[PDB]
Amino acid sequence: AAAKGPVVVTGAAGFVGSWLVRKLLRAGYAVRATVRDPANVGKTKPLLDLPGAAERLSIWKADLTEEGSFDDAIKGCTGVFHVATPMDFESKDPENEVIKPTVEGVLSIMRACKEAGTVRRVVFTSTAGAVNVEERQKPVYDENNWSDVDFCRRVKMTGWMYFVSKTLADKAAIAYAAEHGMDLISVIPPLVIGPFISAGMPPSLLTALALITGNEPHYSILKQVQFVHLDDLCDAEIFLFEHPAAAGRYVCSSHATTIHGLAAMLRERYPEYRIPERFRGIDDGDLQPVHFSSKKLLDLGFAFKYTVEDMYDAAIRTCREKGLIPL
Template sequence: MGSSSEEIVCVTGASGFIGSWLIMRLLENNYTVRATVRDPDNMKKVQHLLELPKAQTHLTLWKADLSVEGSFDDAINGCTGVFHVATPMDFESKDPEKEVIKPTISGVLDILKACAKTKTVRRIVFTSSAGTVDVEEHRKDVYDENCWSDLDFILTKRMTGWMYFVSKTLAEKVAWKFAEENNLDFITIIPTLVVGPFITPSMPPSLITALSLITGNEAHYSIIKQGHYVHLDDLCNAHIFLYEHPKARGRYICSSHDANIHQLAAVLAQKYPQYNVADKIKGVEDEDIKNPVFSSKKLMDLGFEFKFSLEDMLVGAVETCRAKRLLPLTCDGDQVAEKVIPPAQVPAVAI
């Protein structure tokens, strides 16, 4: 496999945090991209895509919805590759079974069925989540591609983001079964918390978590207590790397840095003292923190190299938020939280 102007690929969740950056990199690599969005006529959601270099000649927008059976068929028909990025990600959902879990599972199956029908698709890369790997009561020292989250524990505990962890875990397992039964070349990439600059107009859900020490959103501290991170650009380049590499097979963790909440706080406090991030987080003691490792050995053994540091990720995210007025330039006390777009206003689909 290799990129050329003859390669036509489909990217789902195109307007989102990961999807839009992935499209930017695909266009730079001379791919022709069919980008699926729920409403191609909503300029607020797609303008940043249309403004990308090469968009006029190498990008088309296609209407598709994870909850509408068959809606991806036309966009996928004739493509050589599919990057399935779209996923419902609404932590504030009042009906998570209907709004998050079911559409995630039915959506990936619908996309795989479209790939099986067209006969032109050579490989599918599915954006999974670290939430499929490490959510369990007793954490391991090292997590690799053989690990799966404990669904019983998630459904019992119902921690922040529980519906997302359930939906991604069930969707990936169902997808693997369908792909194997239908002889599809299927790869999953498993990112940890994705952080960095972005081109979407609103704050991405993962940055609401990553920057929660700035905003004071304590509900997300449980996620960053023992955190694992990857830069958005590294992740998108890994998608393309795995799509193109002839020996790529199976699941691939994509994570470059393991950092606990105190280490995250130290970076933010040093780079942005105006946000008054505490170097010690109330209620989180060092003895409560384990430091498990998310291993990207399989990905790196294939030849992939990460380029960005944890500081690069955080600075890129904060500076983009400041430029887009999603974070104030300076603040005192609770003023940050008051000025940040709350999770309920963040687009529910696309990560």
């Protein structure tokens, strides 16, 4: 059996990327994993240790701020999964140090894909922050809703530079694709929870586990939150790449709840962990869930495998093997 056309995974050393490499290898693909520094044995070793990596995984050096650095890796590939994004949201010129670099990085990826000629489809990983960051929160969001970038630059909530970065990059990738007749899929995941291979806690699990720990600054994120299992997300990205009828934006969210609802589930499911009853910065009002509809993805025939219980069972375990207390 011949390896499925070589596909690139950008940011392969990361939380989402590394697991996507695992799943693409398992599905019979030759995977070209790109990282900013393949000489960093620490970050590269987990990838090379993956099942099937010896035969079908290769590591490539590339940087989103370095025009053309992805040309060699993409050349000859049938698909590109763009998961990398700049994550340094603590600068003093976010427009020029985060926003523009994020949009120029995605556009340069698209250019390299066009030049290659061999790429039939690009799968861009967006974020829920490109959908529902507006002044008036709606009860249901789908792939047709777009964050209000003007609103973000006005009130500058926590993480505003990231919402505008991804929202503008998402819009720019689509516009470039349509202008040059390219096949682009944009996948919108909420907070992603699941196993990780890095020795450090993924930033999404710091939020997900903020109730078990005492990570109070993350409480506002859990106020009205949506979840997806990392495995479901990666499987959906492979599904959407292989389905000939797939096109456009897709929401990949399997669970919506509130901080109060999440506290209850962890209370009944983990008596071993002390779950508070009240959370600073969050009143005792009426909180209803905000739903991210994945109808478009499910209509194509995709099905989620994991529940929110599966997610937290997997996160607590991997973390328990290091960065969190067993309490």
